[PDB]
Design a protein around this ligand. Structure first.
Ligand code: RK5
Ligand code: CL
Length: 330
């Protein structure tokens, strides 16, 4: 829709398309005033996309005014304008995304040491979004929405607040990308910032193994793959879940079981300790005898992930406490 030389408002010179999504397009452009390259998110000229992007602008401007630190793992919105009836959001330029990074490993994963560096930045971002006066739920964390700041370095920023909402400003029941969708959302329950911690746990396993932890083809398959690793969810959760009976069945003594389909490993027997290869040289044994990949290192990582993948969103580890975990201690 935009030529690779087009000039906007005697300020921006469009170079190239660097991204696209349901929302519209992302272009690289030169800002003559700041004398720098910028990324311009161009929203489709349709009401549905405009209105949701106006929420995204509001949440990014809310973050910008909380300049008392920990805000620097979120992509910086520089400004926004209307042009040709497109809402346009101007960001700093970043580099390539963590899915691209995994693709580049041939989906064999990055080291525990680089996974730790990503985990510490993402926990810090989630600590910032949990600041009471922000209380922002990202709602679509996944490798594609985490970008390197610089192709030479391991700094990252989160992008895409297109699904995001403040606590108590929920619009959609059906949210998150399926692989990274929290049990509370699959179960149709009111959700809070804990869904992002669930996503992050899924993401960190994937960054190290090269493969998604829970690759469901649909919601029923998604919940079944979660149950393979983590077992049947606690009764107290299932007793409150509008969609419990999408996946489970309640028995005489207040117990729940999987709804069985026509012919999964039995509940809780696909152990994260074997996905990670804690005692077997890491994922597919590919880290056998590499530095920083000892059994003790792996056990700390496994402990932290199992805290991120708590079924109970009330007891699931929170960002501050994740940052104090021994996985991050030198
Ligand atoms: C290189 C680069 O730099 C970027 C900076 C911001 C965003 C961006 C994309 C979407 N969908 N939402 C937001 N908030 C930012 C995308 C990019 C890309 C791609
Ligand atoms: Cl385990």
């Amino acid at each position: 829709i935009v030529k690779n030389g087009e000039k906007w408002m005697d300020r921006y010179e469009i170079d190239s398309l660097i991204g696209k999504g349901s929302f519209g397009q992302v272009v690289k452009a030169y800002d003559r005033v700041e004398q720098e390259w910028v990324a311009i998110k161009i929203i489709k000229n349709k009401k549905a996309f405009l209105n949701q992007a106006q929420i995204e602008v509001r949440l990014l401007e809310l973050m910008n005014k909380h300049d008392t630190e920990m805000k620097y793992y979120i992509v910086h919105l520089k400004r926004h304008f209307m042009f040709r009836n497109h809402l346009c959001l101007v960001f700093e330029m970043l580099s390539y995304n963590l899915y691209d990074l995994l693709r580049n490993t041939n989906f064999r994963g990055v080291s525990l040491n680089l996974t730790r560096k990503f985990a510490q930045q993402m926990c810090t971002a989630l600590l910032f979004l949990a600041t009471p006066e922000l209380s922002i739920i990202h709602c679509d964390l996944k490798p594609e929405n985490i970008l390197l700041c610089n192709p030479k370095r391991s700094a990252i920023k989160i992008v895409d607040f297109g699904s995001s909402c403040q606590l108590g400003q929920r619009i959609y029941q059906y949210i998150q990308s399926r692989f990274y969708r929290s049990p509370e959302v699959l179960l149709g329950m009111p959700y809070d910032l804990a869904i992002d911690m669930w996503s992050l746990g899924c993401i960190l396993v994937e960054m190290h193994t090269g493969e998604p932890l829970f690759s469901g083809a649909n919601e029923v398959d998604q919940m079944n793959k979660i149950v393979e690793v983590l077992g049947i969810p606690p009764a107290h959760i299932l007793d409150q879940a509008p969609k419990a009976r999408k996946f489970f069945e309640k028995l005489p003594d207040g117990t729940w079981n999987l709804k069985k389909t026509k012919d999964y490993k039995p509940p809780g027997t696909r152990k994260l300790h074997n996905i990670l290869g804690v005692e077997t040289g890491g994922p597919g044994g590919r880290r056998a005898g590499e530095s920083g990949h000892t059994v003790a290192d792996y056990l700390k990582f496994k402990d932290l992930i199992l805290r991120m993948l708590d079924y109970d969103p009330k007891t699931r580890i929170q960002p501050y406490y994740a940052l104090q975990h021994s996985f991050f201690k030198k």
